[PDB]
Write a protein that binds this ligand. Structure first.
Ligand SMILES: CCCCCCCCCC(=O)OC[C@H](COP(=O)([O-])OCCN)OC(=O)CCCCCCCCC
Ligand SMILES: CCCCCCCCCC(=O)OC[C@H](COP(=O)([O-])OCCN)OC(=O)CCCCCCCCC
Ligand SMILES: CCCCCCCCCC(=O)OC[C@H](COP(=O)([O-])OCCN)OC(=O)CCCCCCCCC
Ligand SMILES: CCCCCCCCCC(=O)OC[C@H](COP(=O)([O-])OCCN)OC(=O)CCCCCCCCC
Lengths: 622, 622
């Protein structure tokens, strides 16, 4: 168990001016009783950095203890404690000391000074030589489940994540050791990545992150105008725009994608108003990192690399709405050509399976078996090529990619049935029939091409599968227990001869075909009737409970988001159709126009023109 | 693709003082560097109007570029640019120049000056001879789907639609070229039509339209008192009151229909308060264009020419509520006489079809066949006369006029069955039986005569048909795929012999009569049982999804509008019953009384007296 960072009740473990007297001095704050420590350290040839004066488990020095105990942001023992350290000839420094444990690794006194919101204590460390790039890489400072606080591991990133502009302003320009806006942590995250990382979708945190993101980006142009702070990638190869898309942060992603500035800081904009006429506003949006022409775009990340529930809200944002709409209109002919190629494949599949012989017409049947075999191999190779490129997509989006599983399973059992027809066995017919079911159920993937059938295919999957799958467990307990009961009691002659037959007769009560009768060919005829009556009452109550719960969870008056999920379904279809087939790869067509927008700190960007009509917003500006 | 109207990033296409130097001068605004253009134009004998100085795709001149770039509503290059144009001897003028493309056709500099809300630039063009009746008839300025802005194509209509009273006041009375309130566009729409056309049903736009409608109507009496601005019809023959009814604009239609003024502008009122006593207010409403005595009234337009979802909210407004109520009371005897004539027609239809011979009593049967034949011809001629006069009603109101289709189809198969009885064939009996079904289902049209059965017949059609019709598509895929599966697997002897028989046995599971058993006369008996079990589970889940979605879309706590839809159902019945039959045409009875209301700018109008009791509104006035 990790020890506490600061405790006025539990003393630090150990794993004349000793440590216990020293730590009590800096806690109380009076510096006059620090006399005698400098002479004691020179006599024993010891330093304040060594393990005798720090906490054994972590390495918390006396300067960290003094900073952890501040009165109105100032502690009178902080300034003189560095004087004993400097005058003792320490090869290390107390200001650059860090904890060495697994939980608070790299925690420094500058991090605690920034967290205490004491600008005076932050300044006092820098004038005495505090490194402003010291890293807190302990498990408390990583983002995980449980008790943690991720802020970007840097003093400048900590000041930005805690909303302290005076610390940020002092750390960026100071004549002793200025902080770099280009600094990174173990994840490769800069201060712009860290502001994305701390953000949830609440309005208050979103206002905090957006205000700090814009301010840091503007001060980046004043200090280091020759460096694009937005285009720095981490160790996972993600820009802050790409990192917001992967982690599903709806507010900071929308603000960066539609960033608008005027006058000064105008090259820091991704949106450019072009002309306005009444309720019509026409804008130009930057397609850098957004267009799917290049590798690992925002579109590819949202469609296949994001786990967040609000992926359908990122896809309907601007310019992602119009960019994918024009891409859909160029591929709607290819989508329906693929739909026509699957109708012919299943028209042949249905005709051949309908004319299967017992265990010209024979030549037409042999040609049909070849087309099924070649069609199965073509579908098998395409889906295997899909999972080789989309390896992590099916493990996070089973409710969004199960047709890729079903197309794979239908293709495998199609080929396997033809193998079981070459080597003559009876089992090829159940496999060919079951592939006839799975392929016909695969036509419903193509209902997303039309908006009408597409939004209907979204409203039907309201959250019913994993209620009905732990509905199954209680059901199967009721069914199995009553089934093994009925078989044992029916053995006495003076109906139910197996577990499977009794289970089928009990399942018939939920389809409206349950036989309820007073059988006279059984000794125990009252008790069987009471067991059947008890099962019917228990099942009807339990089915009634399941409706009542499904209605409490699904009729909620929350706005119907079936339009957005349908747009996400097309965006997956477009981004896969833009890669072509496995045998033929389509070339990538870039979107937008190369336009000059000003001067870089010329400034040529690939801009997408968006025409938007909004009568509501225009009337409020009158 | 149309080029942008104004772009600081994309230069205008081309489809010494050249165009590129000239367009940069008027964009920046300094007029001192315009020197040399007048001498250059006289040397080359060129003008500013020609295509060398305008955009090739559209025809955007330099004056349009100068107006598109205004600083605080004024550009210093606008006034001197007209001096080079005037001094060069141009047969045309730069102020009356218009774009020639398909998208911005007829766009002038006066339109941009009004849209920029610069009264100084609007004035400066008129003193130099800007035509105030120039027309913007391009596709951007027509009302359609996509990016557009319809305002009435006129400078006065543009100023009225953008809420600029100072531009409207200046354009109507100016000593150079005043604007006419009687001016029209290609649709025939005046400024009063255009204010109706731009209005949606939001409260903010409705307040904007009503305020501009009343103000323009009052200034019409001051400027041109001898012209009725409200009675001008467009090329579709619609007054602004009629145009609001056809496009379903609930707010501006109610305000015009119940317009009340006092003192001055009192002849501009359609409602006149007659006497008040406590909570009782008695008013007189103008029946001009409203009463169905004349052709193409508001009642005829609302019932048969409107596509808007809120047609039932226009019919319950005043005086439309009391006018149709008194018309219903004069026709409720004719409605029930028509109901009694259809009961006798179907009492004969049921008796004759019940006594059909094999393939006095014979004379009574022959008389019954004649009455069915004559009754079928009478119903066929009436419905064919209906669709000759109501040609566009059945194509926009299928959920409101399908009984006219069903009465037509029942009459056709009635006559066709008698034809197939004259030429002796066996197929007349299925047609006569199916006409017996369709005629009995046609009695439910007459349930709207009673309020009780009428409002019930409205609550039952909550929106369930087109959910259950794209519910059908997924269903039919499940049913057909499992049906062709079961037939193929049942061919091995050691049930389901056709697609139709298997489809019927699978459909029986949704009516509670599905047979689930372990058949021992089939080789593949486990796999058939698993296929049946999979079909039952898939169908039950999918039926459960359809209930959950129907309940999420229909129990919404929105107020029940079944009373208003029932009133719209009677209004269609009254307006069709007022035309009489096809053989006999009833004369039209005018409503209201001819009363003098003042002096026209005597003033005799056909006024409808409405007595209204409202205790709630009276108590707030105390
Ligand atoms: C190898 C070079 C020759 C190629 C042969 C011609 C193939 C045409 C390409 C094609 O249209 O395939 C469409 C379809 C793929 O479905 P999907 O991957 O889009 O959907 C995936 C969803 N997860 O594939 C099918 O539906 C089955 C294709 C086999 C039958 C072809 C019949 C042709 C009729 C003209
Ligand atoms: C291993 C064998 C498994 C066989 C399972 C066969 C299931 C077929 C898939 C199916 O039911 O059709 C899905 C259809 C459209 O879904 P979608 O494209 O919107 O979605 C695609 C991306 N989400 O929408 C529906 O019809 C759903 C209504 C029925 C639900 C049945 C639940 C299936 C599990 C019991
Ligand atoms: C040609 C000159 C002689 C005319 C013959 C007498 C016809 C009376 C007119 C009449 O009442 O017709 C009522 C009904 C029409 O229904 P609908 O158009 O109102 O509803 C239309 C809704 N879409 O029509 C019927 O129900 C069927 C009429 C045929 C049987 C008449 C039986 C008479 C019993 C007294
Ligand atoms: C080509 C052959 C087609 C035969 C279709 C037969 C349908 C008969 C019409 C009917 O069902 O009765 C309608 C009844 C009253 O409707 P309405 O007068 O309020 O409305 C008149 C103006 N809206 O209200 C109801 O009873 C509705 C409840 C049943 C709905 C059945 C849906 C029919 C399609 C499957």
């Amino acid at each position: 168990e990790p020890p506490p960072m600061e405790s006025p009740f539990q003393r630090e473990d150990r794993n004349r001016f000793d440590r216990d007297r020293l730590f009590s001095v800096v806690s109380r704050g009076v510096p006059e009783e620090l006399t005698g420590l400098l002479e004691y350290l020179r006599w024993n040839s010891k330093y304040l950095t060594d393990s005798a004066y720090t906490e054994g488990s972590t390495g918390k020095t006396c300067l960290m203890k003094a900073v952890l105990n501040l009165q109105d942001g100032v502690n009178a023992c902080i300034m003189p404690l560095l004087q004993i350290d400097k005058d003792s000839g320490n090869p290390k420094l107390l200001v650059n000391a860090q904890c060495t444990d697994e939980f608070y690794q790299g925690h420094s006194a500058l991090h605690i000074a920034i967290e205490k919101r004491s600008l005076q204590c932050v300044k006092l460390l820098v004038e005495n030589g505090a490194d402003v790039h010291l890293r807190a890489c302990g498990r408390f400072f990583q983002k995980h489940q449980g008790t943690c606080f991720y802020f970007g591991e840097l003093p400048l990133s900590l000041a930005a994540c805690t909303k302290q502009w005076d610390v940020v302003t002092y750390l960026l320009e100071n004549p002793h050791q200025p902080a770099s806006l280009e600094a990174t942590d173990s994840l490769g995250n800069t201060v712009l990545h860290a502001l994305v990382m701390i953000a949830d979708n609440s309005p208050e945190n979103s206002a905090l992150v957006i205000h700090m993101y814009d301010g840091l980006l503007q001060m980046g142009a004043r200090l280091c105008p020759t460096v694009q702070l937005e285009e720095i990638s981490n160790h996972q190869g993600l820009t802050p725009l790409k990192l917001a898309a992967k982690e599903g942060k709806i507010e900071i992603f929308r603000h960066i994608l539609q960033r608008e500035f005027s006058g000064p800081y105008q090259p820091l904009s991704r949106k450019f108003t072009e002309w306005c006429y009444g309720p019509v506003r026409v804008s130009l949006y930057d397609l850098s990192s957004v267009d799917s022409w290049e590798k690992n775009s925002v579109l590819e990340i949202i469609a296949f690399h994001c786990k967040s529930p609000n992926r359908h809200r990122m896809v309907v944002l601007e310019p992602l709405n119009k960019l994918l709409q024009e891409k859909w209109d160029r591929l709607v002919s290819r989508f329906f050509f693929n739909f026509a190629c699957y109708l012919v494949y299943m028209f042949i599949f249905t005709v051949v399976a309908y004319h299967q012989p017992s265990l010209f017409g024979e030549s037409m049947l042999l040609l049909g078996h070849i087309l099924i075999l070649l069609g199965g191999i073509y579908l098998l190779l395409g889906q295997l090529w899909y999972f080789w490129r989309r390896r992590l997509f099916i493990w996070i989006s089973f409710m969004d990619s199960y047709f890729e599983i079903l197309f794979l399973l239908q293709a495998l059992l199609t080929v396997l049935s033809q193998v079981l027809r070459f080597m003559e066995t009876e089992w090829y017919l159940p496999l060919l029939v079951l592939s006839l079911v799975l392929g016909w159920l695969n036509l419903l993937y193509y209902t997303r091409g039309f908006q009408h059938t597409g939004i209907y295919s979204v409203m039907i999957q309201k959250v019913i599968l994993r209620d009905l799958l732990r509905f199954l467990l209680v059901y199967l307990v009721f069914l199995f227990g009553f089934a093994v009961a009925l078989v044992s009691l029916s053995r006495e002659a003076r109906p139910y001869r197996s577990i499977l037959d009794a289970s089928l007769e009990l399942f018939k009560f939920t389809i409206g075909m349950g036989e309820l009768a007073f059988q006279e060919q059984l000794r125990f005829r009252g008790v069987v009737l009471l067991l059947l009556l008890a099962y019917v009452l228990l099942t009807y109550v339990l089915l009634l409970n399941m409706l009542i719960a499904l209605m409490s969870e699904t009729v909620n008056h929350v706005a119907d988001n079936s339009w957005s999920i349908w747009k996400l379904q097309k965006a997956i279809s477009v981004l896969e159709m833009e890669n072509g087939y496995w045998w033929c790869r389509r070339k990538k067509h870039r979107e937008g126009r190369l336009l000059k927008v000003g001067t870089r700190g010329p400034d040529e960007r690939w801009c997408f023109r968006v025409e938007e009509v909004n009568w509501a917003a225009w009337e409020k500006t009158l």
